[PDB]
Amino acid sequence: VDATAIPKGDVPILTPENVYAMPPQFWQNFQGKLWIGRAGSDARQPGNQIPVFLRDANGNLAQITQPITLNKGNFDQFVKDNAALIANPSHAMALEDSNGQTVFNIPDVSQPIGEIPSVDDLRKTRPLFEGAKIKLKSWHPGLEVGGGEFVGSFQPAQDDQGVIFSGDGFHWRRVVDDYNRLSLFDFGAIADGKTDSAPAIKAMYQWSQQSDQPICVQFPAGTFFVTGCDFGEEQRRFFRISGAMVNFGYFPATTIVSDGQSPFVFEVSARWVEISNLIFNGNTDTKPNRQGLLRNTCPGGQFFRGACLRFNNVGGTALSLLDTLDCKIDQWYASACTGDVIQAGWSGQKKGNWDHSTAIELSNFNAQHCKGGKVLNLPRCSQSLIHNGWIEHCDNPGDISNGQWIIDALSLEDCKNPLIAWHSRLNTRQTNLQSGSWIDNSEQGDRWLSAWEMGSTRVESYGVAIDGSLKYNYLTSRWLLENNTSQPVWYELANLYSPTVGDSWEIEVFGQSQFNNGTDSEPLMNLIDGRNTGGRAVIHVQRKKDHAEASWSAEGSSPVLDVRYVAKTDTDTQVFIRLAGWTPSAAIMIKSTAKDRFVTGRCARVDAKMAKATPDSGSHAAPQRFSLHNGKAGVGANEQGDLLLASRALSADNVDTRKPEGFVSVVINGKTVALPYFAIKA
């Protein structure tokens, strides 16, 4: 029979692949009768057989009489000849064995097992009928990975290299129980750390985008070689990439390795990105390169989610984000990275004012021995947070300049250069700085925001530093002293440690002696021992060239009668006060010029004792003096008990000495007297 003796639209319905794709027992043992019949009826029935043509590899096109006898001999011959059965794709098919038992009876193959070794063979194996089930042993020949059950179809579907495998006028659909349990194995990846799994990653991403499946790129456990993947230009909504989903906090079960040729292993443009449970070994220690893990190119708002990420020997920028709206990177470790680790920039697009990054939360991270680039390349990060982070033996902790950062429990240890935080609005607790490490929060370089927005607050166990305003309801003391007794009592206030020669302390004993009514019953005549409401004592202490010395003043109804001091060392000064009788509550409030713990390690201390203690023999009386002036004239008092006065001394020659010009009412001691003054000669 000839070439154009074949009906229009007739196709090969059975090939050697159909012999291979049925169990060995069937090939070798089966003997029976095959009927290719008219569609919509039993093919064994009379006048139902449609034309069938045997075609050799040579190009033979002989018509074959039905039923077609099947047996090992005819199978062997069909395979050897690389032959094919051509007939109507719309056909009935019926097979019975040597006896008469119907194996199958399909009236229309277009309308509703055996094993296949590879995808290569699957794409060349036509289904027997619409719904025909097959088992794929493995994606690649004899790797025992990326296999599963497959349902055959004649309907047109494009090969996606994972779920749909298409041949000439047919395809096989992977039977997927849970779509969220597919991996790169299903898309033809191999965990040998050599075979490029980039085609599998590109195939699985395109599949997820088209079929709208959120799992996206899913790595199974093991090591994967990946060449640069550019999904670039086109803005997508989602790019998710996750390693083996197991609860391993430290070491993910998936590792990525590359050739260091692309600037990033993954080049994406997506509004929402999620990357987790991955180790990236950049191999920059042995084959130096500039290859990072992921860059997001999408302008006008990015959302990022990182979790359980290890960057080992990365020469490039590990993560590069753009126009960040919300970035959460938790449980990430960087070891011996020579490039930037966490980098975020802005498009500069005037609209939405994309001239900064927003809501960066970095938590539970450890950067070790990172030399060359910046661990944090995060300038202009507003409404951002750092929680429980360690950066050790890293040259450049990096840049958080012009930012707004809550920083809880950040540790810098043995870092060559400081964390750059120029014009950065920091709000910190428990910053741990060892081995010469520090944070540079100075006003160097360019300020992004107005001068009015500048300042940072540091809240430490050892004190508070506010580069800004303070306001409170009231100022109290940690130490309230009480003398509910008519007799005075000697207390030891504290031992003052003065780290530097010339350091000055002022102890304000705020509060008065007496709490009895009738202070407005009589006018005050005795300014010292009178009946006035209000009072304080002001003790001055300064570390001198050798040891220290003291001097004290008071106001109103003084809470202190006397103060003595003991200068045991050059740095140490014990301060005692004779707490006046009937002193109900006296608050201890201190001013100091001494360096605090923020400045030096061997810093200023107030070793508070606040205990009843008589000053020992060899204690020195702090002289009772005050001195209020303008550097020319003023008023004071001395320890002898004389009022001190200072003013321009006068020549008697310029004074009308004849008699006082006038008088003014002054209450000298207890008595209202008349203070005289003389006229000044013109």
- Give residues 426-485 in contact with a copy of itself (rule: CB under 8 A): 426-427, 429-430, 432, 450-457, 459-478, 480
Peptide bond into 615 cis (omega under 30): no
Please state the closest distance from residue 676 (CB atom) to a copy of itself, in A. 6
For residue 320, what are the β-bridge partners? 295, 343
Cβ closest to a copy of itself, residue 4 vs residue 452:
452
Please state the closest distance from residue 614 (CB atom) to a copy of itself, in A. 19
8 Å CB contact between 581 and 450: no
Instruction: At 265, list the tokens.
Output: 């292993």
* 580 vs 562: CA distance, rounded Å: 9
Cβ closest to a copy of itself, residue 57 vs residue 680:
680
Q: Map the footprint of a copy of itself across residues 518-557, applying CB under 8 A.
A: 518-520, 523-528, 530, 532-535, 538, 540-547, 549-556
Q: Map the footprint of a copy of itself across residues 253-312, applying CB under 8 A.
A: 253, 272, 274, 276, 303, 305, 307
Cβ closest to a copy of itself, residue 61 vs residue 587:
587
Among 230, 585, 610, 613, binds a copy of itself (CB under 8 A): 585
Cβ closest to a copy of itself, residue 53 vs residue 139:
139
* 174 vs 151: CA distance, rounded Å: 7
Among 1, 5, 57, 501, binds a copy of itself (CB under 8 A): 501
Q: Burial, 589: exposed, middle or buried (Cβ in 10 Å; 0-12, 13-18, 19+)? A: middle
Binding mask 630-649 for a copy of itself (x = CB under 8 A): xxxxxxxxxxxxxxxxxxxx
Residue reference for tokens 């590879």: 118
Neighbouring CB atoms inside 10 A of 533's CB total 12
Please state the closest distance from residue 668 (CB atom) to a copy of itself, in A. 5
487 binds a copy of itself (CB under 8 A): no
Cβ closest to a copy of itself, residue 1 vs residue 464:
464
29 binds a copy of itself (CB under 8 A): yes
Q: Binding residues for a copy of itself, how many (CB under 8 A)?
A: 210
617 binds a copy of itself (CB under 8 A): no
Instruction: At 396, list the tokens.
Output: 């450049």
125 binds a copy of itself (CB under 8 A): no
Q: Map the footprint of a copy of itself across residues 176-205, applying CB under 8 A.
A: 178-180
* Amino acid, res. 632: K
For residue 553, what is the enclosing H or E element?
strand 548-556
Please state the closest distance from residue 660 (CB atom) to a copy of itself, in A. 7
Cα(first)–Cα(last) distance of the chain, in Å? Answer: 150
Using CA of residue 458, residue 464, residue 468, residue 471, what is the dihedral sign?
Answer: positive
572 binds a copy of itself (CB under 8 A): no
* 491 vs 398: CA distance, rounded Å: 52
SS3 185: helix
488 binds a copy of itself (CB under 8 A): no
46 binds a copy of itself (CB under 8 A): no
Cβ closest to a copy of itself, residue 11 vs residue 157:
157
SS3 62: strand
Binding part of the chain for a copy of itself, among 10-18, 194-202, 368-376, 502-510 by CB under 8 A, reads 502-510
486 binds a copy of itself (CB under 8 A): no
Given the DSSP bridges, would you call strands 626-629 and 634-637 parallel, antiparallel or unpaired?
Answer: antiparallel
Alpha carbon 607 to its chain centroid, in Å, reads: 40
Among 598, 612, 614, 616, binds a copy of itself (CB under 8 A): 598
Please state the closest distance from residue 452 (CB atom) to a copy of itself, in A. 5
Using CA of residue 122, residue 126, residue 131, residue 133, what is the dihedral sign?
Answer: negative
Please state the closest distance from residue 357 (CB atom) to a copy of itself, in A. 14
Among 79, 589, 610, 613, binds a copy of itself (CB under 8 A): 589
Assign residue 670 a region: left if phi > 0, alpha if psi is -120 to 50, beta otherwise? alpha
249 binds a copy of itself (CB under 8 A): yes
Neighbouring CB atoms inside 10 A of 85's CB total 18
159 binds a copy of itself (CB under 8 A): no
Q: Map the footprint of a copy of itself across residues 389-428, applying CB under 8 A.
A: 390, 404, 406, 408-409, 411, 425-427
Among 291, 312, 512, 574, binds a copy of itself (CB under 8 A): 512
Q: Burial, 669: exposed, middle or buried (Cβ in 10 Å; 0-12, 13-18, 19+)? A: exposed
* 236 vs 660: CA distance, rounded Å: 99
Cβ closest to a copy of itself, residue 79 vs residue 459:
459
DSSP letter at 63 equals: E
Nearest partner of 109 among 174, 37, 166, judged by Cα:
37
* 239 vs 222: CA distance, rounded Å: 22
* Amino acid, res. 564: R
* 267 vs 69: CA distance, rounded Å: 58
243 binds a copy of itself (CB under 8 A): no
Among 45, 69, 364, 619, binds a copy of itself (CB under 8 A): 364
Angle at 244 between CA 238 and CA 248, to 5 degrees: 115
SS3 19: helix
Please state the closest distance from residue 35 (CB atom) to a copy of itself, in A. 15
Binding part of the chain for a copy of itself, among 10-18, 113-121, 583-591, 611-619 by CB under 8 A, reads 583-591
211 binds a copy of itself (CB under 8 A): no
Cβ closest to a copy of itself, residue 6 vs residue 608:
608
Please state the closest distance from residue 49 (CB atom) to a copy of itself, in A. 20
7 binds a copy of itself (CB under 8 A): no
* Amino acid, res. 627: S
Nearest partner of 216 among 191, 237, 238, judged by Cα:
238
115 binds a copy of itself (CB under 8 A): no
Binding part of the chain for a copy of itself, among 7-15, 46-54, 194-202, 513-521 by CB under 8 A, reads 513-521
Residue reference for tokens 């920083």: 407
Binding part of the chain for a copy of itself, among 2-10, 53-61, 367-375, 587-595 by CB under 8 A, reads 587-595
